[PDB]
Amino acid sequence: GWPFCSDEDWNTKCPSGCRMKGLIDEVDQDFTSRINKLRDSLF
Amino acid sequence: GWPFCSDEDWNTKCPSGCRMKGLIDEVDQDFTSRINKLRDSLF
Amino acid sequence: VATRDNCCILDERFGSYCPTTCGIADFLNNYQTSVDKDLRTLEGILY
Amino acid sequence: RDNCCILDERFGSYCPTTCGIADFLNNYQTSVDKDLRTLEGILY
Amino acid sequence: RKPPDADGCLHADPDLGVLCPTGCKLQDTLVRQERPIRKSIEDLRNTVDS
Amino acid sequence: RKPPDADGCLHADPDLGVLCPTGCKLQDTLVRQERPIRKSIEDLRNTVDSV
């Protein structure tokens, strides 16, 4: 039950690296899947 | 249920900053307390 | 690589330096917003 | 004092990792603990 | 969906606990991932704009 | 005892979760704490011998 962050906490306090790797991978999967759908359509 | 880290993982995967701050706080409280007790035994 | 000249807080007893996860999150946000825009644009033309 | 180590403009200012923090903390804690123990041994 | 977590490992010492990728590892991943995505998209754009 | 955790805060964006001190904040903390602790020990050594 940590205190809620303030905008001033950013850069002094940062997210977990495991969380960031999860989000990075999710974005990569979304983009690769969307690129493949566009490729399938165009050619 | 993460896999156990290997010796090779160190420096590429690291502990939570919140955990390290907790450990740093604990060490400082220990040393501060011990220094005060040593001062009390001397004067 | 961090050096006395390009890193004012450098203390080598602490090992090699890296971006923070806030730097990572900010890069990811900029990259995701940018690429998603380009994609939506193509998806609107083709779909 | 938290924006003076920007080694790549795309990624912000750099810092040591928490592995570096943990290794430093281990050496510091054990070093100082031995020094305190020597004093505590003499006085207690 | 629950926010995703990836690539952690458990250290045997409970005080260290779960270890996560450093900013250096995350930066490497992002730089490498961005390359083909950006190039693929420029390629698609060039085809659509031709 | 259970492993201590300190100085986390919960971010407004549910995807970011709990934020923790960076390596720079942790290094600053340690650099500032070590100086007076080491100095106190040097002073105690002088006190013991003059004791």
Side-chain angles (χ1 to χ4, degrees), chain E residues 1 5 8 11-12 14 17-18 20-21 24 26 28-31 33-35 39 43-45 48-49:
Chain E
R1 62 90 178 88
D5 293 309
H11 194 283
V18 179
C20 294
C24 283
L26 295 164
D28 172 73
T29 295
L30 278 165
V31 164
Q33 286 181 340
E34 177 184 38
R35 285 174 181 146
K39 287 176 180 165
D43 174 65
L44 288 166
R45 176 185 175 179
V48 172
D49 291 324

Side-chain angles (χ1 to χ4, degrees), chain F:
Chain F
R1 84 293 181 255
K2 64 177 177 181
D5 287 318
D7 301 7
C9 69
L10 177 67
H11 194 276
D13 179 340
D15 274 357
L16 297 181
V18 177
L19 310 191
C20 294
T22 65
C24 287
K25 179 64 180 180
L26 300 160
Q27 172 183 112
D28 188 52
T29 298
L30 280 161
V31 168
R32 290 184 181 198
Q33 295 176 330
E34 174 182 34
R35 297 190 177 148
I37 291 288
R38 302 263 186 202
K39 170 59 172 182
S40 291
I41 285 164
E42 293 182 72
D43 291 333
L44 275 165
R45 288 169 181 161
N46 292 328
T47 301
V48 163
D49 297 330
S50 76
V51 152

Side-chain angles (χ1 to χ4, degrees), chain C residues 17-19 24 31 34-35 46, chain E residues 23-24 27 34 37-38 41 48:
Chain C
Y17 284 34
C18 296
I24 296 302
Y31 163 69
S34 175
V35 171
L46 289 297
Chain E
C24 283
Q27 170 179 47
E34 177 184 38
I37 290 291
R38 296 286 200 180
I41 291 174
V48 172

